[PDB]
Each structure stands twice: as C-alpha cells, then as structure tokens.
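Inputs:
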Amino acid sequence: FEKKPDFTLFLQTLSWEIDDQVGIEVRNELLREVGRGMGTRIMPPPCQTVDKLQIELNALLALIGWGTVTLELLSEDQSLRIVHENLPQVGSAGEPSGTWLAPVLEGLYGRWVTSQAGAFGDYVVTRDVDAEDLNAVPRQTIIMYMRVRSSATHHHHHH
Amino acid sequence: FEKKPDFTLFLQTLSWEIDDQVGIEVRNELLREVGRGMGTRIMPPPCQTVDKLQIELNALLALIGWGTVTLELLSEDQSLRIVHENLPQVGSAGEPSGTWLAPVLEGLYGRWVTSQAGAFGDYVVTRDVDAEDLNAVPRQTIIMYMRV
Amino acid sequence: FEKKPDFTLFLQTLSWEIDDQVGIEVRNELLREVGRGMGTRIMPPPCQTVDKLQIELNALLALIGWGTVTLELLSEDQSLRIVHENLPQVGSAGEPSGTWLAPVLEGLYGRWVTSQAGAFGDYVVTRDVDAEDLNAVPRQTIIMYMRV
Amino acid sequence: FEKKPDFTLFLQTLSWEIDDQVGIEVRNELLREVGRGMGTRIMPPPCQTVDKLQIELNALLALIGWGTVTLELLSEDQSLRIVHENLPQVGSAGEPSGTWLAPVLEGLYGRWVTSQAGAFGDYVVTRDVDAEDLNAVPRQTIIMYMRVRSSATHHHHHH
Amino acid sequence: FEKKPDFTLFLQTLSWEIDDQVGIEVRNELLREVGRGMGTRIMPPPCQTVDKLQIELNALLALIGWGTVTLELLSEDQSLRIVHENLPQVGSAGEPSGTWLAPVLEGLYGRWVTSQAGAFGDYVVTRDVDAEDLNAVPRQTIIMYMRVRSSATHHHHH
Amino acid sequence: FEKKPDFTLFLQTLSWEIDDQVGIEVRNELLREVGRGMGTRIMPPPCQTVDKLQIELNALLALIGWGTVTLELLSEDQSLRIVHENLPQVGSAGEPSGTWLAPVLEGLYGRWVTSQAGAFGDYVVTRDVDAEDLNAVPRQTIIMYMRV
Amino acid sequence: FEKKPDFTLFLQTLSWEIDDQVGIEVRNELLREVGRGMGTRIMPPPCQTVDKLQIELNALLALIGWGTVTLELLSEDQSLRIVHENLPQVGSAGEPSGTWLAPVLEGLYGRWVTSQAGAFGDYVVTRDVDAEDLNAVPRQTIIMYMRVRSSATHHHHH
Amino acid sequence: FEKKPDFTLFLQTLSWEIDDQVGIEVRNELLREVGRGMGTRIMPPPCQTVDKLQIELNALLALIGWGTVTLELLSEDQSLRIVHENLPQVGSAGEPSGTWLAPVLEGLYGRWVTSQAGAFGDYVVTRDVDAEDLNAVPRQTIIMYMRV
Ligand SMILES: OC[C@H]1O[C@@H](O[C@H]2[C@H](O)[C@@H](O)[C@H](O[C@H]3[C@H](O)[C@@H](O)[C@H](O[C@H]4[C@H](O)[C@@H](O)[C@H](O[C@H]5[C@H](O)[C@@H](O)[C@H](O)O[C@@H]5CO)O[C@@H]4CO)O[C@@H]3CO)O[C@@H]2CO)[C@H](O)[C@@H](O)[C@@H]1O
Ligand SMILES: OC[C@H]1O[C@@H](O[C@H]2[C@H](O)[C@@H](O)[C@H](O[C@H]3[C@H](O)[C@@H](O)[C@H](O[C@H]4[C@H](O)[C@@H](O)[C@H](O[C@H]5[C@H](O)[C@@H](O)[C@H](O)O[C@@H]5CO)O[C@@H]4CO)O[C@@H]3CO)O[C@@H]2CO)[C@H](O)[C@@H](O)[C@@H]1O
Ligand SMILES: OC[C@H]1O[C@@H](O[C@H]2[C@H](O)[C@@H](O)[C@H](O[C@H]3[C@H](O)[C@@H](O)[C@H](O[C@H]4[C@H](O)[C@@H](O)[C@H](O[C@H]5[C@H](O)[C@@H](O)[C@H](O)O[C@@H]5CO)O[C@@H]4CO)O[C@@H]3CO)O[C@@H]2CO)[C@H](O)[C@@H](O)[C@@H]1O
Ligand SMILES: OC[C@H]1O[C@@H](O[C@H]2[C@H](O)[C@@H](O)[C@H](O[C@H]3[C@H](O)[C@@H](O)[C@H](O[C@H]4[C@H](O)[C@@H](O)[C@H](O[C@H]5[C@H](O)[C@@H](O)[C@H](O)O[C@@H]5CO)O[C@@H]4CO)O[C@@H]3CO)O[C@@H]2CO)[C@H](O)[C@@H](O)[C@@H]1O
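Outputs:
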C-alpha cells in the first residue's frame, strides 16, 4: 500500500465538535486523562538526574514526533519547570488558538515525572497561561510547572 | 524531505478514554458528527455519474490517506452499497475490535453523497451489512448503505 | 513508505503552452477561476477571529503543501493584507518570472475569506502590492489585499 | 522547509474548468501540444532497438513517476503498439473518467519515438479508444498506436 | 539535517563481539532481560480478549517497526502460541543464523502478556526451536509458546 | 527526515559515453576492477558456513541497495552458484540491455568470496550469460559461478 | 520493495579506478562529454532573459538533485559567470579533492546555455580554479565562466 | 520508496541493561572492540593527505548516518585532533549522559586511521573527556586524539 494516514483534519473537526458541546473545563479534564493514559502506554526508565530524565523524555516524544522538551530544576523553591516546543497544532481550537492538545501534555508530563521513583513523587502539573510569557513564546510552545501537591484546606473540603 | 507528528497513540488512548466514559451509542453519534464535519471541510465537485463520484471520493480519501472506496448502484431501489477498504485503525476499540473510527465514515459519506443535492440528497447511511452480517469481510473493511 | 507522481514538468510546459496561446489576461482569469474552484473543494470552518482564520488557512495550505500565509487586519478600512510565502514555482512563466500560479491565490483566498459570509463576504482581492510595488519581497512571496 | 507541494487538487480543478469552457477536442489538442513540449524538455538517446527504446522510455517516465510503458513492434503491418500503465489520475474528467491526462501521452510519445533517428521518422500517434479493449484493461492503462503517416487525399485538402 | 542514524552495522558487529566473549546461553539471558526491559518502556492497555491484545501488540510493534504478530488461544492447555513475523535481522548470528534478537522477543512478549491483569501471572514464554518447524516457516519468523509456570522440589540445586 | 542527489541519468550517459569510446571487452574489465575495489571498501566478516555468508552479503547489498543474492553450493563438482536479483539498471547499455553494471558484481563477488578464510581463497568468477538460463530469468537478474 | 539503489560507493571507486589508469586531463574530457550528453537528455525551454534561464536550469538541477545555480550577466565582456552550489561529492578525487564531477558541469552548462537560440552559439565554458577563489567558497561550490569562443592561426598544430 | 525497522528503544534498554550488570570500564572496552570491528567491515581507500582522509571518513559516516567528522593535524607535537559531531544518542546512558556510543568511535577511528599506509600505522586514541572543552561543546559532539 502507501505511507500511512493523516489524523489532523479529523482532530481538527473533532476538537471543534467537542468544544461545541462541552465546557473548556470538561474538555481539558478529558484531555489530561488521555495524557495520563498516553504516559502509561509509554514511559522512561527510572532516571537519577533531571538532566537524564530530559534526554529520556525527549526520546519518548520523538517516538511520536510530538516535539521537544526542556526541564529546569528550580532548586530555590524546589519546583520543576517544563518548557515544551511544537505541541502538535490541530486547527484553531484551544486557548490560545492552535493549542487545544495542550492539556494532554499536562496529563502526559504528570504521569511521566510522577512515575519517577520517589523523587517528584506527589507533584502536580499546572500549565502557565499568564499573558506576558505566552507572547514572549511562540504559539505551540507550552510552559508548565511541576510543584509539590499542597493539600486541601477543610474549607475547600466542601467539594 | 521533512516529516512531523503522529496522532495514533493519542487516538488509542482517546478512543479508550472516551469509550470508558460515554458508552458505545454516544461515542458513535459524536463520531458521525465529526464525520459530517470533515465532509464540510473537504468535498467533491457536483458529479454526473456514480463512477465519476467514486473517483472524486477516492481522491479525497487519498488526500488524508484514509482508505479507498467503491460505490455501486443497486437496481432494486436505486439504493447504494458503499464498500470502504482500509479504514484507519487506532488500537482495539470499537465493534469489531479496531473499527472505532467507523462512524466517522457514516457521517463523512452522509455529507459527501448528499452534497449531490439531486437524486441522493434525501438519503441516509447505515453502516453494518444490512443483511446485518458482514460475510468474509476483512477487518478495516467497512460496508455501508445509502437509501430513502 | 511508498511514493508516486509529480506534476511540475507538466506545469512548466502547460504554463508555457497556455501563455503562448492565450496571453497574460485570459490566462490569469482562468487561473483565478481554478483558484475559486479549489476553494469550493477544500475549506476552513466559520472562524471567529482573523487569527483563528489564519491557522485554519495554513492547515489547508499544509494539506497540499502550497506555502504559508499571514492574515493581518488593517485599522484604516477594516482592510486585509494577505502575505503568502512559498507559492509553488513551476518554471519561469508569470510576472515576475516563476509566479505563474499567483492568480490561483487571488481566486483561492477570494473564496476562503468570503466563506465567512459575515463582515468579509462582500470583499475583493487584488494581488500586487497595492502601493503597486512589492518592496524587497522574495520571489514566491505573493502579497494581496482584501477590501470593499 | 518540508517535502514539496501537491498538484493534484489543482489539476483536478483545472481540468474541470478547462472542460467547462472548451471542447473535448480543443482540450485534447492543447494537451498533445503540452506532450510534445514535455518530450522536448526530456528525451532518450538514439536507441538501436525498440527493446532499448523501451528501457530508455521507462527511465524517463520514472524521472517524473508517470508510470511504466511497453513497446511491441508489430512487424506484420509495421506499426508500433504503446501500452502505458498508471497514467496519473487527476479527478474524474477525461473519457473515460480519470483519464484526462491521456492525450499528453500522445504528444509525449510521438515526440519521443519520432526523435528516434530515421526509424519511426514520420509516424503518428493514435490512441485506441475502442470499447472492448478499454474494459479489458484498467482505467489508467492507456493504449496507443504508432503507425506511419498516410498523407491527405486532395478531397481532404479542403481543410 | 537528514533522516538520522542506522544501527544494523552496529548490531551486526556488536552481536559478533558479544558472541565471541560469552556463551550462547548467557547472551540469551542478557537479551531476554533487555526484552523484559523494552516491555516496561512501552506497554499495551488492559485488554479484554486475546484478539484485542493482538491488535494492541501489533500497534506497539509498529512503533519501532519490529514486525507483526499473531496470538492464538489454545483452549486445551490454556496455553497460548505466539507467532511473530519479520524479526529484524542483524547479521548471521543466533540460531538459526539471523535470529540473534529472538531472545529479545521472549522477554518482550513475556512482559507484555503478563501486564494483562486477567489470567496470566506466572506464565512463562519459551521459544519453539525444532527442525521442520524452523524449516517450515521463513527464518525471520519466530514461534513461541506461553504456558503456566510450574515449580520444582528435587529440582532445586546449588 | 531529509534527502539528497541522484546519479542514474549521469550513469545512463556515462555507460553510453564509455561504450561508445572503448570496447565492450575493456569496459567490462574496468567494471570488474571497480567491482573488486568496492569489495575492499565494504566487506563481510569471516563466515563459517555458506548460509551465513549469504545473510552477510545481503546485509552489505541492502546497505547500498544493490538488490539481493542467493548462494548455492554445488555438490556435483566444487562449484558455487551465485544468483543476484535486482541489479541496478542504468539505461539500455550492456548485454542484454540494462545490465551494464553486471561485471561490477563479478569483481564485487569475486572479492567478498575470496576474502573468506581458506575454503574459497583461490576461486574465479565468470557470469553464465547463456540464453537458455536467460530467456527464463528477469533482465536485472544476474547469474554467476565461482569455480577452479 | 524499498526505495532503490545508492551509487556513491560505485562512483567513489569508479572515480578512483579511472584516475589510476588515465591522466587527469583525459578524465576531464571524458567527464565534460558525459556532461554535454546529460544536457542532450534534459534541456530548458528557450528563455528570453538570463533570469528565466536561471529559474529554468535550477528546475532541471532539482530533477536529479545536483544542487542549485546562479547565473550573472557581466555586461562588459558580454561574458556570463556561473556559480554552482552543492556539486555531488563522490569520494576524495578531483581537484580539489571532492570535486571529481566538476568537469561534468562544464559539459552540462555548455550544452544548456548553448541550446538557447539567442546570443550564445560558439560560447565556451571554462571552470575557474584559482587559489582564494577556491579558498573563499565551500568546496562543493564550482565557479565557471561563459565567454565567446575565439579561434587560432599559429596556434594550429599537429 | 519504502522503509523498515528501528533500533533506538532497543539500544536504550541495552545500554541500560549493560551498564547495570557490567562496569563503566568494561562496557567501554566492549564498545571499543565493537568500534574496531565496524572499522573492518567498512573502510576508506589509502589516503594521500589528511584532507582526503576526512572526505573519505565522512563518506563512510554518511553511509550509516552516524554524523560528521573533522580531522585537524597538529603541528606542535605530532598529534591528530578528531572532532566528531552528532554521535547517535541512545538514551541517557554514558558520561556525559547520551554518549554511551562514544567508545565505539575510539575503536572505529582507531581502526580507519591506522589502516592508513605508513604515516599513521602506529597510533592510539584516547577521547579528551575534559570539562573545559566540554561545557563549551554539544552533548553529541565527541573530541578524540590520535597520538604516540
Ligand atoms: O495523486 C493522487 C491523489 O492526490 C491527492 O492530493 C495529494 C494530497 O494533497 C496529499 O495530502 C497526498 O499525500 C500526503 C501529503 O503529501 C501530505 O501533505 C499529507 O499530510 C498532510 C495532511 O493531509 C494534513 O492534514 C496536515 O495538516 C497539518 C495542519 O495543517 C497543521 O495545523 C499542523 O501543524 O500539521 C498538520 C500535519 O503536518 O499536513 C500534513 C503534512 O505534514 O499526507 C498525505 C498522505 O500521506 O498526496 C496526494 C497526491 O500526491 C488528490 O486530492 C487526489 O485527487 C488524488 O487521488
Ligand atoms: O534514533 C533516536 C530516537 O529513536 C526513537 O525511536 C524511533 C521510533 O521508533 C520512531 O517512531 C521514530 O520516527 C518515526 C517512526 O519511524 C514511525 O514508526 C512513526 O510512526 C508510527 C507511529 O509512531 C505509531 O503510533 C503508528 O501506529 C500504528 C498502529 O500501530 C496501527 O494500529 C495503525 O494501523 O497504524 C498506526 C500508524 O501506522 O505507527 C507509525 C508507523 O506508520 O513515526 C515516527 C516519527 O515520524 O524514529 C525514532 C528514531 O529516531 C527513540 O524512542 C528515541 O529514544 C531516540 O531519541
Ligand atoms: O535509478 C533508476 C532510475 O533513475 C532515474 O532518475 C531518478 C530521478 O532523477 C528522480 O526524479 C526519481 O525519483 C524522484 C526524484 O528523487 C525527485 O527528484 C522527483 O521530484 C522532482 C521532480 O521530478 C521535479 O519535476 C521537481 O521540479 C521542481 C522544480 O525544479 C522547481 O521549479 C519547483 O520549485 O519545485 C519542483 C518540485 O520540487 O523537483 C522534484 C523534487 O522535489 O520525484 C521522483 C519520483 O518521485 O528517481 C530516479 C532514481 O530512481 C532515471 O531517470 C531512470 O533512467 C532510472 O530508471
Ligand atoms: O537492516 C537491514 C540492512 O541494514 C543495513 O544498514 C542500513 C544501511 O546503513 C542504510 O544504508 C540502508 O538504507 C539506506 C540508508 O538509510 C541511506 O543512508 C543510504 O544512502 C546513503 C548511501 O548508502 C551512501 O553511499 C551515501 O554516501 C554519501 C557520501 O558519503 C557523501 O560523500 C556524498 O556527499 O553524499 C553521498 C550520498 O548522499 O549516503 C547516502 C545517504 O544520503 O541508502 C540506503 C538504501 O536506500 O538501511 C539499512 C538498514 O535498513 C546493513 O548494512 C545490512 O547489514 C542489513 O541487511
């Protein structure tokens, strides 16, 4: 036969449909879940330094051509900063536009750096969405932060 | 020369996630809708014969490298058998296993043939064998009918 | 894995043959029409912002690997500058040499932006610099305006 | 940048437009001319046997991925039979549908086998379009005949 | 740049080097371990039927281009035969010549098939290596079986 | 994911030029010498068995994509039959046409095989260019013998 | 099958073989002839301006992936300089090392530029080969000039 | 126009397995021996000048796509500086991470260079793994020396 099939247009019209029907919020949660899932299908070994983890992670991202990543350990607060380039673009959906697949990275990365034996054991992944940084960086560049889960206040425990 | 992103592992986990959360029926209507959606994005010209229509449809399928299709007219009803080969496979989801994307076709062909706002245009698509059993048919061969 | 046919030597001789027989003006209207034609075959969704529109247009251009485009709104008229990079080149035909396919874009963008049957939709495209001189602009960069 | 651009959809909508405006006849003549032209841009050396010419011709067709060809010298009348597979399909135009580019082959081949020093010096190329043969063979398979130009009768000389 | 590096020449000579130093037994255990290792880096989701697992595994194999596979539930032993096409050839090493990487599949399939929660924990994968089963199928075809592990009393030594 | 230059048209003209200026006979020695020299640049390891040698030679062949080979060790007298499939074809030069590159294999195989420890060290290579076992085999299939 | 054969290893050793037997002069004439030959098999259409010819030639070069070229009309000599990027390298042969196929371009450009009906009949192509013109540009860059041929009276010998 | 298998993930697991079971020190000899052995299988012709040797080595390097090399013949004492760019990276193994394959080049270059007639026959290869000329050079750039 021939070189295998194209899923952009599909994802283009899928993302549109899902957006049409579901909150920005609902969609993102579905999309993180899918990230977690992706991270359980493919994973790095147990790396001993962030630097090694980075090489390992890029290796994985190259399996599927989903771009490149840099990991900077911000020792001064002990957070981990995830800077990911060329998130695949699937049409104009997402905030900002072109960036719909972003929360998959959140799922994918949280699954990946948590799998890391003991180190970033119970961290959480926030995406950075602050204005100033987003137009310092290109469209498809996504900035995330990995920091340690602070637990809920009881005031919040009301769901 | 140059190459870029793949989406299939994503769809493997998406299909799964979706199926786990919504069920077969809701997932399928969603998938018909997306099928219809694509059909508004890329489309054939106004074809004069079923044969010509086939070519124009295969051209479009080639564009995204989803499979190939044979349209063939049925003299019983002016009904229309649609045989699609090599539907992209995205893991083991769907019924039968590996045909998760099948409703996209019902939607897609739903749009395309109706685009010919003439004889067909008041028509519908149904996706299984309408003997209601697909006989000796490869996985990734999806058989549909267009009628009314 | 597998690969197939190329059409560029054909277009080199076609462009030439056509130009030799019809002239610049008739060839160009023909080429706008074909531009429009493509625009009915493949098209974006109803975009809400000029930015979103850009992405959806680049997606389509990527589909056939004609170049890339930046749309940018002009606060003087709600006018619209269109900058298209890497128009396919098919030999030395056209003005400037190598831009034979340029009118296809006037036609194509003519269709696409009008598809947004709202603010634009009663608009027109004109293809040269409308300073009427393209300044320090690479060959295969085609600059157009959308107005009225 | 990236792998270079796709001309099918263009040709698809071009062939449609030209057909819309111009006779089947006018178009074919334009298309043969383009064939002649193509044959003047690329050409075989002077081959000494049809068999060699065939290898040479296929070589050229492979430059542009325009399919494969077989040449059988029909000694018994001294005509040359050209059987060409996978004429590139450009939409549904042409007679039969899918076959619009066929008369380019007529131009291309006549130019190619005529360039041949002295041998098929002043032959002409007819396409075979007879019903029976066309559905013995696939869509994109085109059958042509190269035979020696018989001159016009004066009765025909009235244009 | 240009589509990057080829590793066959590396493996042809790496396989030769290793074979020179090391018994064919030790080499196999090494290879089985890496196979078990590969299966930790890339895994299937939890499948409900063998058939699903087969689609799922083939999908994984496709990622790295290591051929295709067919699983077959043999209802009488509750054993499972694994027939794998087009193992990548890396020179003339292994038994038979060309199948050096076969022990890898043993580790790979063993990990993969086990990850499945259902029935399989404490199943072992062993390669079928028998005259006229090797003669019947092309050489880059590797045939394995998956049976339930048994344990051993007298059989404990050392 | 990128790509580079093509030498067929060149080699089509080269063979043509060469055959025109020097004989058929001296063209063939040239190519045998070249074939021999290629063999020095790329070479298999010390092979225990003929089966193993084959895999090894194919490895090398695959690496420059010059087709595939079969080695048949002949029982009756101490021969070694070499069947090479898919010799690169470089225009209509050679005999039969399109087989110009063939002596390269005489040189090439002559080298690889005699580099083999002790068993084959002192062998020759004539290509069996007989019509009887030719009108039956593909144009780009070349049949050789290792003997003495 | 799979995308077919690579000829560099052939040319590396063919170039070496030829160089061994034959003066570097004879080898060049041979190569120039094949270049003239290549230009008979693939040609530009009749161009009106140098610029058009440049688009047209680059188009031909693209067909076989033999690099890109820039032409430049030098108004004073009515001469024409041809600057060609990325000549395919085929081992270390030629002068300088790596440019063996350069004589080919001489034949190629000579044929191509001549096919143009206009001014050029009886123009000759000669390669520029001068210290610090070779040092200035990358090595797979070949610089040639195209001037009108002159003829010779005393200069006829043999 | 077709394509086949990938060994990176394998080699990611292999290095990992190997480093875990055998030392850093014995892993490196293994790889040097392998590198040496690769050098026997593929090899350049007898090179007149160091410049020529470079082109030749790159030719070989390109053939398996293991990156590019520079040879600097050192005047002060009789050294030969080897700078290899784009060593295939095979996971985070090695020191620095992702440079596991590096000793292969010690073996590889050690071989190719000493195969060279008379000038270099008796040389050694230690890779200058100094932080000073490392925190400046790319991770996949490897710097070696030929001496004695
Ligand atoms: O000649 C027979 C056949 O031709 C058809 O026309 C072309 C067709 O245009 C080509 O698509 C097809 O073959 C491959 C294409 O060369 C390649 O461009 C395509 O991959 C596209 C993909 O289709 C597209 O959805 C994707 O979108 C991008 C988005 O726009 C961006 O937002 C995002 O960032 O990136 C994605 C993906 O990169 O772009 C990719 C390009 O990477 O894959 C095709 C199949 O493998 O070739 C045909 C001919 O050569 C014509 O319509 C028919 O009439 C005819 O039968
Ligand atoms: O060498 C350094 C680098 O290597 C990485 O490993 C490889 C990796 O294995 C490759 O994926 C990658 O480059 C391309 C692959 O060659 C190609 O296989 C892949 O496309 C795959 C896709 O990844 C996969 O999801 C897809 O699944 C199929 C399903 O299994 C089926 O159900 C369905 O029917 O079809 C789909 C699609 O066909 O298969 C396709 C193959 O068509 O695309 C990759 C990018 O374009 O190359 C790497 C080598 O560079 C290694 O992980 C890294 O550590 C290391 O840095
Ligand atoms: O080896 C046996 C076989 O070899 C034949 O020679 C080559 C031949 O040179 C190749 O064309 C062919 O396979 C593909 C080519 O690698 C590729 O270059 C070609 O695509 C070309 C296209 O042919 C050409 O028209 C196009 O023109 C450009 C213009 O010049 C520019 O103005 C414009 O901007 O861009 C266009 C397009 O980019 O360039 C493209 C390159 O992108 O496609 C070929 C088929 O897919 O390989 C052969 C080797 O097999 C030789 O002739 C035979 O004798 C012999 O049998
Ligand atoms: O796995 C089975 C098989 O594997 C073999 O190993 C590889 C092999 O290394 C590859 O060559 C082969 O497939 C293609 C290669 O990916 C590609 O590099 C090659 O093209 C090479 C060409 O071979 C080489 O001569 C050429 O030389 C350059 C010069 O060095 C430069 O001076 C000059 O400027 O440029 C030329 C050419 O650009 O480089 C090109 C790269 O462009 O083509 C191969 C065939 O299409 O893949 C195999 C893996 O599948 C292994 O040896 C065998 O043991 C085994 O059977």
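Remarks. Residues A 4, 59, 62-65; B 3, 6, 8-9, 89; E 4, 59, 62-65; H 6, 8-9, 12 surround ligand 2 (CB under 6 Å). The two ends of chain B are 48 Å apart (CA to CA).
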